[PDB]
């Protein structure tokens, strides 16, 4: 009862599903006792600012923002998806597009998710950097959709010739929106990276709320609601991890910088 908790969301899952946004708020307030409010922004960077500055108690964010601000944030918990707390980046093209590999997308109009996304930018940036080109040199046009669901839409609709997307989001939409997703196919799958975690500011790690929150996430599979929420997100639940999960990502950040 003491007040109001601010919990941040990013489109690292289907945050358009208002139904889930509801159940989720429900499970959290019960588990935490106080009223929890879910926050969203237009971009990742915006959420990341609010989180670093402690304006949000915690937030569900991509692995890339977490490592970029590694020092100013700590892990709370990481989703489990199909057994393991990991995911891939999918480079997607049109279903009927006849092409072999990445190199054939030269000259595409390309949809990225967010300049701060691992699966929606960084991974593909790496593929470019290893070939000594940038997006402006390799693609005839590129743009940010500010969300993974949106990348898939862009490709499916024909607005983009190819796209870079969170593979979890793609595999979930393959079942919740199968006709859309069926207008795309996966051209390249990355290696496995740490699943987008929940996290909080480091100079407020020793906090009641985080602990209250860290708890809510691990025990989610133990409530009736929390089990409904998980079913919706197609996740097994949340586990504790350390920064070492996210090394694959930091090493890509390093490859991009060193290759530039």
Author numbering: 45 to 304
What does the publication say?
The regulatory cluster consists of three genes, aioX, aioS and aioR, which encode a periplasmic-binding protein (PBP), a sensor histidine kinase and a response regulator, respectively. Arsenite-bound AioX is thought to act as a ligand for AioS, the sensor histidine kinase that upon auto-phosphorylation, phosphorylates AioR, the response regulator, which binds to a conserved sequence upstream of a RpoN promoter. AioX exhibits a typical bilobed structure of the PBP type II class. In this class of proteins, the ligand-binding pocket is located in the space between the two domains.
Figure 5 shows the AioX ligand-binding site with arsenite forming a link to the sulphur atom of Cys106, confirming the role of this residue in arsenite binding. While the majority of both structures overlay very well, there is a significant difference in the rotamer conformation of Tyr88. The change in the side chain conformation is further associated with the backbone shift for residues 83–88 and a significant conformational change in the loop region comprising residues 53–61, demarked by the black circle in Fig. 5A. Interestingly, while the structures of apo-AioX and the phosphate-bound AioX contained a monomer in the asymmetric unit, the arsenite-bound molecule crystallised with six molecules in the asymmetric unit of the unit cell. Although the six molecules were arranged as the three repeats of a loosely associated dimer none of the interfaces is sufficiently large to be indicative of a biologically significant assembly. The arsenite-bound crystal structure of AioX showed significant conformational changes compared with the apo and phosphate-bound structures, specifically in the loop of residues 53–61 and the shape, as well as electrostatic potential, of the protein surface. AioX and ArxX bound arsenite with a Kd of 177 and 311 nM, respectively and no interaction was detected with any of the other substrates tested (data not shown).
